[PDB]
Amino acid sequence: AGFCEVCKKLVGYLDRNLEKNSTKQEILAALEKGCSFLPDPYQKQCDQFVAEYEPVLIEILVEVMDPSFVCLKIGACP
Template identity: 30%
Template sequence: MLRNIFLVNLLVYAVCAAHWEIREVDSAEDQNEDMCADGIPKLNLCKTCKDIIEKVKKHVFCDSTSDEIKATLKKACEKAGMLLKHPCKILVKKYLHGLIDELKTDDGPNTICTKIHACK
């Protein structure tokens, strides 16, 4: 009888350990999904996008050419602080065409960054 109780406890422990291991792996995969391909957290990419769009929007108008918008985006990245410069350049490189199209609209930073999928 004691042997049966021991075996049942051992079985329960093994099942719980396997379940816990699976949950840890899923958790690690979820954390990796929050990273962009360039290693920048999506949250930072979203914040960077909003900050840059807010600054660029002041200098871009509906009739601005694509080259003017591209130059304004690059200039904004150069003027960004140390922490924003690298994420800004990655953002502009990755989403350039979408940013150019969206900056020609009257949409705000939240809408633009959501439309280009830099934010959720």
């Protein structure tokens, strides 16, 4: 549950601002900008989470963007 809430949060914003057919290159850009959009308290945690999981984030978010489920599959929410 360590990175779970920030995961749900970061993937939440992606889902909410990205169309379900984006290319790898648009999910990358979004991910690398996504943390500055979360409330202040989460920023530094988020872009640490992003640095650790963004290969798998990209690999999965081309398929599905449900935040609740994406964080589960990647292991962030146990």
